[PDB]
Amino acid sequence: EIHLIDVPKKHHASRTESYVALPPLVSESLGFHNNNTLAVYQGLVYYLLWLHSKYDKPYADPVHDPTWRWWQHKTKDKDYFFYLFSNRLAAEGIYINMNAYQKLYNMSGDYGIPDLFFLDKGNWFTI
Amino acid sequence: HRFKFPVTQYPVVLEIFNERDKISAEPPYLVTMTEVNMRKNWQLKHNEPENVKKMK
Ligand SMILES: *[C@@H]1O[C@H](CO)[C@@H](O[C@@H]2O[C@H](CO)[C@@H](O)[C@H](O)[C@H]2NC(C)=O)[C@H](O)[C@H]1NC(C)=O
Numbered sequence: 001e002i003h004l005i006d007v008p009k010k011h012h013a014s015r016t017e018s019y020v021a022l023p024p025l026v027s028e029s030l031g032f033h034n035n036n037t038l039a040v041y042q043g044l045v046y047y048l049l050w051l052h053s054k055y056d057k058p059y060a061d062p063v064h065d066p067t068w069r070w071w072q073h074k075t076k077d078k079d080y081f082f083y084l085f086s087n088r089l090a091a092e093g094i095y096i097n098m099n100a101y102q103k104l105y106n107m108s109g110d111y112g113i114p115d116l117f118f119l120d121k122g123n124w125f126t127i
Numbered sequence: 128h129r130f131k132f133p134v135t136q137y138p139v140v141l142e143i144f145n146e147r148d149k150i151s152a153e154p155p156y157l158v159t160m161t162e163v164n165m166r167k168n169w170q171l172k173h174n175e176p177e178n179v180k181k182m183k
């Protein structure tokens with residue numbers, strides 16, 4: 001048999017930036033999604049990628065991870081919003097979760113030797 | 128339990144018991160005080176952080 005152990009992180013080695021955008025929750029008893037719920041999902045994914053594009057501005061900004069500037073003040077109201085959804089009192093029954101739409105830096109997922117490797121000025125890797 | 132005239136800053140410690148643990152009462156678990164005997168010469172003082180301004 002042959003095995004690779006002490007493999008190196010695929011996303012760091014291949015230098016890939018990864019986002020996550022999970023669908024908004026629905027209070028419908030059967031769990032189905034309307035066309036308007038899918039429209040909301042569409043717009044939220046678009047706005048995530050829009051921040052991905054606008055993060056390339058020259059000025060640093062105070063906090064890394066661009067999605068911060070999207071949530072900002074709203075992060076203080078989460079319980080309130082969640083309350084209105086738990087008791088199904090919230091508008092069209094949709095729930096927009098802050099943590100659902102964000103850029104992941106470190107995850108432990110698919111492994112093995114990555115295909116691409118990137119090197120810069122004497123940095124090394126091991127297999 | 129007996130108390131001396133003015134009772135000031137009497138701490139209402141609320142503990143939630145969850146089998147494995149007992150944690151303190153959190154701001155999501157907002158609470159109400161009532162006096163079942165209908166007396167009304169009492170006051171309750173509390174701090175409001177900007178986590179309940181909207182819940183409250
Ligand atoms: C989801 O589908 C509904 C239809 O069930 C769309 O609502 C229609 O919108 C048009 C606008 O041109 C109206 O003429 C129709 O009368 C509407 N239908 C009803 C039943 O009122 C709705 O637009 C769709 N959702 C989205 C986001 O486009």
Ligand SMILES: *[C@@H]1O[C@H](CO)[C@@H](O[C@@H]2O[C@H](CO)[C@@H](O)[C@H](O)[C@H]2NC(C)=O)[C@H](O)[C@H]1NC(C)=O
Pocket residue numbers: 136138172173174
């Ligand atoms: C309720 O009374 C307690 C005292 O038992 C207060 O707790 C103190 O708060 C001050 C800050 O103002 C701290 O310096 C002390 O260390 C605290 N003591 C203890 C034992 O926790 C509490 O602040 C009071 N509640 C409110 C809303 O003011």
